[PDB]
Amino acid sequence: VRASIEPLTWENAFFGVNSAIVRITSEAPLLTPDALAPWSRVQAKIAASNTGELDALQQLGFSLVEGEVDLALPVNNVSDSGAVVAQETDIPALRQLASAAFAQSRFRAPWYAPDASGRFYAQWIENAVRGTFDHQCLILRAASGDIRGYVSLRELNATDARIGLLAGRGAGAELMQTALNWAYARGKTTLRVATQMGNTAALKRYIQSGANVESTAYWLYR
Amino acid sequence: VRASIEPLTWENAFFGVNSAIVRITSEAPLLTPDALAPWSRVQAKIAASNTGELDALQQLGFSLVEGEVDLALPVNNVSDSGAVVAQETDIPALRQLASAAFAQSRFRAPWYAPDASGRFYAQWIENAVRGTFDHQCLILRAASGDIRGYVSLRELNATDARIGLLAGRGAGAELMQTALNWAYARGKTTLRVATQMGNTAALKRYIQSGANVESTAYWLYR
Ligand SMILES: CC(=O)SCCNC(=O)CCNC(=O)[C@H](O)C(C)(C)COP(=O)(O)OP(=O)(O)OC[C@H]1O[C@@H](n2cnc3c(N)ncnc32)[C@H](O)[C@@H]1OP(=O)(O)O
Ligand SMILES: CC(=O)SCCNC(=O)CCNC(=O)[C@H](O)C(C)(C)COP(=O)(O)OP(=O)(O)OC[C@H]1O[C@@H](n2cnc3c(N)ncnc32)[C@H](O)[C@@H]1OP(=O)(O)O
Numbered sequence: 328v329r330a331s332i333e334p335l336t337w338e339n340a341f342f343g344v345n346s347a348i349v350r351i352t353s354e355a356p357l358l359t360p361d362a363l364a365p366w367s368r369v370q371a372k373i374a375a376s377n378t379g380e381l382d383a384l385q386q387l388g389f390s391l392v393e394g395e396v397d398l399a400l401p402v403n404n405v406s407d408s409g410a411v412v413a414q415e416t417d418i419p420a421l422r423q424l425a426s427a428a429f430a431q432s433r434f435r436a437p438w439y440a441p442d443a444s445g446r447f448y449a450q451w452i453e454n455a456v457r458g459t460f461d462h463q464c465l466i467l468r469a470a471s472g473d474i475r476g477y478v479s480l481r482e483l484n485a486t487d488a489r490i491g492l493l494a495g496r497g498a499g500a501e502l503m504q505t506a507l508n509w510a511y512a513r514g515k516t517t518l519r520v521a522t523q524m525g526n527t528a529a530l531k532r533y534i535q536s537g538a539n540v541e542s543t544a545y546w547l548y549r
Numbered sequence: 550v551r552a553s554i555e556p557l558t559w560e561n562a563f564f565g566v567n568s569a570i571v572r573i574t575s576e577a578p579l580l581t582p583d584a585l586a587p588w589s590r591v592q593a594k595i596a597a598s599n600t601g602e603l604d605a606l607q608q609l610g611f612s613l614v615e616g617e618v619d620l621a622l623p624v625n626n627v628s629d630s631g632a633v634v635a636q637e638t639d640i641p642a643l644r645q646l647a648s649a650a651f652a653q654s655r656f657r658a659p660w661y662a663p664d665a666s667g668r669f670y671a672q673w674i675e676n677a678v679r680g681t682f683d684h685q686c687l688i689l690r691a692a693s694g695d696i697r698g699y700v701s702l703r704e705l706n707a708t709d710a711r712i713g714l715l716a717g718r719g720a721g722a723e724l725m726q727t728a729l730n731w732a733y734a735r736g737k738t739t740l741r742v743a744t745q746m747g748n749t750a751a752l753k754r755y756i757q758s759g760a761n762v763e764s765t766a767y768w769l770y771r
Contacts, residue, residue, distance in 0.1 A: 375616060376747030378653055391613040391767070394597060394746055435600065524616060524746065525598030530762040540752040545613070 328383040330358040332369065341450070342434070342443055344368055351380065358387060363549060368438065375543040389547035392433050394524035398538035400503075402488070402510040402518050410505040413456045413464035413477065420474055421456065421464060422449040428494045432523075433546050452492055455479035461491040465505050467498055478502045480509050488513065490520040493529075503536040550605040552580040557592065563672070564656075564665055566590055573602050585609060590660070590770060597765035611769035614655045616746030620760040624710075624732045624740050632727040635678040635686035635699065642696055643678060643686060644671035650716045654745075655768050674714055677701035687727050689720055700724045702731050710735065712742040721754040729758075 330351040339346055346368035349358065356362065363369055371389055373380040413421060426445035434444040455461035460481070467476040476495020483489050488510040493502050510518045520538065522529040552573040561568055568590035571580065578584065585591055593611060595602045635643060648667035656666040677686035680703075689698040698717015705711050710732035715724050732740045742760065744751040 374747065375745075376749070378615070378657065378747075381613065382659065385612050390607050391603065393600070394616050394765075394767075396746075431600065437604065523597075524618075524765045525596065525600075527598070527762055527765060530765075534756060534761045539756045540749055543616075543746050543749060543752075545616075 397521040425452040499532040619743040622760040627733040647674040
């Protein structure tokens with residue numbers, strides 16, 4: 328296996344770690360134990376179909392962290408769910424929800440500090456509200472005015488949008504409708520969303536809403 | 550961590566190995582390096598969501614071999630693809646096809662001998678041909694009489710049937726039609742099918758056919 332090793336600059340500043348990511352290409356230097364050695368953490372993402380790469384990376388000391396499924400949904404005029412655009416005043420509530428809901432990502436212990444995953448996704452949802460990572464966060468409210476669901480969205484290109492984060496017990500159908508309507512309004516044909524392999528509730532909901540699988544992957548760390 | 554460790558009786562005789570399967574549970578002896586010692590190969594299948602078990606096993610030196618997705622679809626509106634029940638005379642051709650099609654299985658080298666996977670899948674399809682009404686291999690024919698595709702099927706219980714192997718380039722739709730019809734003929738309401746996480750062509754076909762995800766798992770070996 329040949330691959331470049333490059334620092335994950337953003338994550339390093341955010342987590343306070345010395346981490347890099349492997350990028351497998353024909354032209355890169357040989358991937359060797361010596362090259363990998365000084366890094367506190369190294370990450371690799373590979374297609375789940377590529378058993379050659381899996382074996383090669385396991386023979387360089389990498390372990391499975393999690394599998395990922397990336398799905399796509401056709402976008403049509405589904406009509407709105409009554410969702411509203413999150414405002415700056417919703418940030419504390421959303422950060423709290425997200426930190427609780429996304430504690431078990433690929434930034435989980437023992438790979439990262441116990442609080443790292445919650446911090447990462449609290450920041451993600453805040454950035455969505457502010458429009459600096461995702462473009463918007465959309466919210467559903469209960470009768471009491473409390474948030475019962477949210478979904479963050481961004482435009483990817485001329486044809487595609489992507490769900491960043493999505494959460495809300497019993498609100499899955501409505502949140503998918505919300506995300507598809509947002510994409511439709513922006514002239515997209517395709518709405519993309521990825522989830523962990525283990526997240527059967529999410530997979531089921533995406534498929535119920537019209538998704539099909541586009542790619543599958545493993546994240547492996549050293 | 551506690552787990553039972555049991556010999557894989559059939560595989561041991563078939564492959565000529567001394568292997569066992571580990572299943573993590575509270576009412577079992579501690580899972581230790583010593584308990585794992587007297588085996589040539591140990592397997593574990595875990596829910597993809599169970600990262601606690603993943604890391605327990607990785608601490609004991611288990612490695613990912615592959616991920617699986619199990620899906621189900623309702624048996625509703627069925628029809629006749631023109632498929633036929635495989636006969637003894639079809640066995641040599643089917644063994645040849647299945648050995649080739651399912652090469653990159655969880656019995657691939659380096660985990661097993663180079664010929665192991667081919668032997669296993671040829672035996673699988675042969676067993677299906679030599680089955681009764683409860684376990685069959687069905688063949689789709691080209692106009693030449695050649696095998697265009699095949700699917701193995703088993704009755705599970707009062708409500709369910711399961712697809713074992715399914716293969717035929719350009720024949721996915723017709724093979725799913727065949728399977729649904731077979732299940733219907735036995736008054737089954739639910740059809741189940743598992744595939745490897747990396748098999749996006751199979752995943753897409755199953756979802757196109759109305760399947761949704763039921764469970765996801767990793768196979769790890771030591
Ligand atoms: C882009 C991304 O963020 S991907 C990750 C998606 N987000 C999450 O995982 C956040 C937590 N999950 C959720 O908010 C919701 O489960 C959703 C949005 C994924 C799905 O919502 P819905 O389709 O309405 O499903 P709902 O929440 O009603 O769940 C139904 C059942 O799934 C189960 N379930 C739901 N989430 C989980 C979970 N994280 N772990 C285990 N079981 C779960 C529940 O037990 C529930 O009850 P039942 O099994 O007794 O029927
Ligand atoms: C229960 C089980 O056995 S699950 C495993 C299913 N069986 C297999 O994987 C055997 C090989 N594959 C096949 O027989 C079939 O392609 C099926 C049944 C999976 C799907 O059939 P269809 O839905 O008709 O898809 P089709 O055969 O048209 O394939 C579509 C594309 O996927 C690709 N593809 C199919 N199987 C595979 C595979 N195992 N690995 C990589 N790519 C594949 C094809 O090359 C084709 O590419 P193209 O569109 O660029 O020509």
